[PDB]
């Protein structure tokens, strides 16, 4: 199927009509997405089978035909931009400042913007472009709203 | 069955809308890959 860098909606038939359960990032000739999307199946591409090679719930991740490959970081200063990929929409870019998720394990920069959890996957870039992480795992906070971590995984 | 859709290149867009505060948490993550505010 189609190979060229790029975001993609991950899709599927089974519920009503097509319904968009995420996004991804096609870089280096491998398909990343968060784990929680697709669960690890596997996924079609045009008449083309992404078959899953790496994966971990904890981290909510995995990648398709190949290691991850995303190893960019927040420099823990500057604005991003999340590249939404929403339900039915055109992808847009927001630009944010990001807050920070402090753990017992260290800090992770975290985007403090509330789309459908279809956005699910939506890359984190920063000024050159640079894919730093993946939208969608996070949590609710006071006031009903939705705080993502920037979710990024190893090169190995 | 689930699909690949093609939506965009990834690149920074020059004057993008810019949203969004810069919230400092305290989270726990649990084995399966839960966040969890810790207050
Ligand atoms: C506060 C809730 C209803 N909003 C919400 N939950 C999400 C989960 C994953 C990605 C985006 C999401 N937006």
Known sequence: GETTDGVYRVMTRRLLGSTQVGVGVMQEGVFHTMWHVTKGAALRSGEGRLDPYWGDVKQDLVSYCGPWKLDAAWDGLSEVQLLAVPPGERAKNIQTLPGIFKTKDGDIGAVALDYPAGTSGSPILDKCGRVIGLYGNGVVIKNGSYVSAITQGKRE | ?39
């Open chain 2, 1 to 39: 069955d689930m699909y690949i859709e093609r939506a965009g290149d990834i690149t920074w867009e020059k004057d993008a809308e810019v949203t969004g505060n810069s919230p400092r948490l305290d989270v726990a993550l649990d084995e399966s890959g839960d966040f969890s505010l810790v207050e």
